[PDB]
Structure formats: structure tokens, C-alpha cells
């Protein structure tokens, strides 16, 4: 399953400093937790490195439940828990994960580069021929990861006074894909995210930022 679910109540009860650090800088903390989970699993199972080589930690029962209408710039870069109804869901797309490039001037295969969620990885020179010139994805030596966008809106029962429901995009990666379905009512834990490539710099209006939730844990609300 390559994914370990950690209860936030248990983490806080055992060690409260990590739990208090967790929602303030979850990108770094979840990176650390993934490395430590890999170590503990490989210690327990030596032969599991040829299965996944990456363990994802999903934080559960986070107490910071904010409804979609209440996310602000205060919440940016923080682990939030929200609930809502999945309204749309792309197909599982393959996203570059450890991308190898071809120098299409000398055909050298430029070593694996990590693909962050924030920006396109663009190589500099070719290590061999030192060309800045065009590269291309080596799609045979690249490893990919599963990607899926969902739109989640507030449950119509929650939106109440006479006002419209609010929706956020969420990104499910590599285990979380196909865990939701248009119509599902879910609990979403993720990092409220600001900084990838959407900032409206095109003078098409005010310098506002598009935000997304990097889903970290998805919990449906139903029988199975």
C-alpha cells in the first residue's frame, strides 16, 4: 500500500512538539515523516525497498477543521482539514516524478530530477556537450506518479444562510487517486497551497493568487 496513516491524536498524545509543528510547516514535516517511515519499514521489512521505495504518511483526525468558506491567506502553507462534496474529478494522469531528459543535440540522458509540485523542472546545460539547447523528456527512463484533480465544494446542507457554496481544487497524488468520486462527501486533509504558477500576472486584473489543496489524507463519509 506504500502509505502509512498516522492518527494526529496519537501523535500529539505521545509527542506534542511534532504535532504542534506539523500543521505549521507540513511540507517539511511530512517529508521528514516519510523518510522516517521508510527507515522503520525497511528495518522491519528489508525486502520492501523493491516494492515502493517511498512511504507516504497520511495524517488522520486533525482537529483543525475549517470549512471551505473560511480559508484565508492566514492558512497558506498549513495543514488544514476540510469537508465537502466532490463535484468533479479528472482521470488519473501520469505526472513526472523523477524525470530523465534527453539532450537532443548529443542524446545524453540527463539524470533524474525531482519534480516538485511548484514548478516545471527545466535542466540547465547538458553535462556532456554543455548545450543549453532543447531537451526532451526521456519517457522510458522517467518514472511517473499518479495525479488527479478534484473539485470539492461545501456540502449544500452546511451552506445555510442563503449564499453560495464555495469550492476548492485539490490534488491527489499516487495513492489518493481514485479514492473519491463525483458525488462523494469526503474529509480532506491537505496543505493550503499558493505558490506554483497561478498568480494572475497577466494584468487581466488584480494580482490575486489561485490556491489549491495538496491532499494528504482523504476519508470518505459512508459505508464501504
Amino acid at each position: 500500500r506504500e502509505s502509512l496513516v498516522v492518527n494526529y491524536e496519537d501523535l500529539a498524545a505521545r509527542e506534542h512538539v511534532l504535532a504542534y509543528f506539523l500543521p505549521e510547516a507540513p511540507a517539511e514535516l511530512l517529508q521528514i515523516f516519510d523518510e522516517a517511515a521508510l527507515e522503520v519499514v525497511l528495518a522491519m521489512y528489508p525486502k520492501y525497498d523493491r516494492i515502493t521505495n517511498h512511504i507516504h504518511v497520511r495524517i488522520s483526525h486533525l482537529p483543525l477543521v475549517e470549512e471551505l468558506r473560511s480559508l484565508r491567506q492566514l492558512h497558506l502553507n498549513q495543514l488544514i482539514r476540510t469537508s465537502g462534496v466532490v463535484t468533479s474529478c479528472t482521470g488519473v494522469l501520469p505526472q513526472l516524478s523523477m524525470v530523465k531528459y534527453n539532450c537532443n543535440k548529443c542524446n545524453f540522458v540527463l539524470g533524474p530530477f525531482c519534480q516538485s509540485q511548484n514548478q516545471e523542472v527545466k535542466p540547465g546545460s547538458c553535462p556532456e556537450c554543455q548545450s543549453a539547447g532543447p531537451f526532451e523528456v526521456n519517457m522510458e527512463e522517467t518514472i511517473y506518479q499518479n495525479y488527479q484533480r478534484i473539485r470539492i465544494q461545501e456540502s449544500p446542507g452546511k451552506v445555510a444562510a442563503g449564499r453560495l457554496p464555495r469550492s476548492k481544487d485539490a490534488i491527489l497524488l499516487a495513492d489518493l487517486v481514485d479514492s473519491c468520486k463525483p458525488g462523494d462527501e469526503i474529509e480532506l486533509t491537505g496543505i493550503y497551497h499558493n505558490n506554483y504558477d497561478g498568480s494572475l500576472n497577466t494584468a487581466n486584473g488584480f494580482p490575486v493568487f489561485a490556491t489549491v489543496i495538496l491532499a494528504n489524507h482523504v476519508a470518505k463519509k459512508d459505508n464501504k
Binding site: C103, N104, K105, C106, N107, F108, E128, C129, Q130
Partner: protein, 202 residues
């Protein structure tokens, strides 16, 4: 730059010269014309010099091959493969320099009389003081400097006094007074002029 000593030369050969590198504190230790001992290591330094032929060369082991329009041929191909000439020359890297034949066994270093005396050992200055007190030192120096030469006592004495020399001076007007004597030997063939000169040289 140093060069091979005369006693090391094989037949028909010019003395080899290698350049030695002196570092932080050894850095001013060898003066031109000094017989010196260099302790250190013989190293190779990459030197840029060819057209004897294409020689040994280094290139990447990665098997790249330029595409059409970018064929790894010519200068572009040599640049792409990281090709460079492995040409080297030998250089000595000296950690330490010492005179080959030290004058005083004690310690080298402004050169005052006391500095020279302190530079000596105890037995060395015993001997220096002894011969300074030597009555008949003039004759003794003439005989011990030119043992194999018979007669020509005046030439021995004059060459000795040349070796000791006078006192240079400077006049208040700036005139410089020569303080070291010059000697010219004029003579018939085979009267040992060249021998006096060789004695003094050695």
C-alpha cells in the same frame, strides 16, 4: 631554475635543468649560482605543448553521439567529448632548501661579524680564533691555498690579499671608492696562470 652539477654530467651531454617550486617559507632560499640541496617531491605539471603528433588524450567514457546537424565530429565533436591532451612535464616541488656544502655547521639565517661568529659551532670558532692569533698566518695561508705550485710567492700573496679585499667607502659628494683589489697575471706559457685562476675558482 636549477641545473645539473658538473660532477654529475655524463659524456657528451649538456647539463639538465629542471624548475623547482618553492613554497611558503622556503620561498627565497636559493639564489642564482648557489649550490643547493632540494628536498621535496618530483611532480608532473600539465604543460600545453604539442605538434610532435597527436598524443595521449582524455575524453569522457559516456557514449554520446551527436544528432544530424550536430554530428560529434571536428572541433564541435572534440569539445562535446571533453577531449584534452594529456601532456605533462616534470617539476620538483621542494619543501626544504639547504646549501649543498654548508659553510658553518651551526645554522644559517644581516651578516655582521658577530652574526657570522654565532653562525658557527664551538670548534669552528676555536679554529677561526686560533688562526687569527696565528703569527705567520700570511705564509700559512699562501702555502695551504696553493700547495701544488712552486715558487711564485708574490702571486700567491697578491691573490690572497685579493681574496680578503679592502674596505669600500662612500664620499659625502656621492663618490664611491673601490674597496676590493683586482689582480692580473701576465706571463710566458706554462707558468701556471691558469692554475692560479683554477685554484681560486675551486
Amino acid at each position: 631554475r636549477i641545473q645539473e652539477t658538473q660532477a654529475e654530467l655524463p659524456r657528451g651531454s649538456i647539463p639538465r635543468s629542471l624548475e623547482v617550486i618553492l613554497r611558503a617559507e622556503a620561498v627565497e632560499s636559493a639564489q642564482a649560482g648557489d649550490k643547493c640541496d632540494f628536498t621535496g617531491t618530483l611532480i608532473v605539471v600539465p604543460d600545453v605543448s604539442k605538434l610532435s603528433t597527436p598524443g595521449a588524450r582524455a575524453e569522457t567514457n559516456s557514449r554520446v553521439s551527436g544528432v544530424d546537424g550536430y554530428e560529434t565530429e571536428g572541433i564541435r565533436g572534440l569539445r562535446a567529448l571533453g577531449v584534452r591532451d594529456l601532456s605533462y612535464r616534470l617539476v620538483f616541488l621542494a619543501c626544504c632548501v639547504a646549501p649543498t656544502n654548508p659553510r658553518f655547521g651551526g645554522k644559517e639565517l644581516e651578516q655582521t661579524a658577530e652574526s657570522i661568529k654565532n653562525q658557527m659551532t664551538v670548534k669552528e670558532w676555536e679554529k677561526v680564533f686560533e688562526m687569527s692569533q696565528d703569527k705567520n698566518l700570511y705564509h700559512n695561508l699562501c702555502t695551504s691555498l696553493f700547495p701544488t705550485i712552486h715558487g711564485n710567492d708574490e702571486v700567491k700573496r697578491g691573490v690572497l690579499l685579493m681574496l680578503f679585499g679592502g674596505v669600500p667607502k662612500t664620499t659625502g659628494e656621492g663618490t664611491s671608492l673601490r674597496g676590493d683589489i683586482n689582480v692580473c697575471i701576465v706571463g710566458d706559457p706554462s707558468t701556471a696562470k691558469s692554475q692560479f685562476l683554477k685554484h681560486v675558482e675551486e
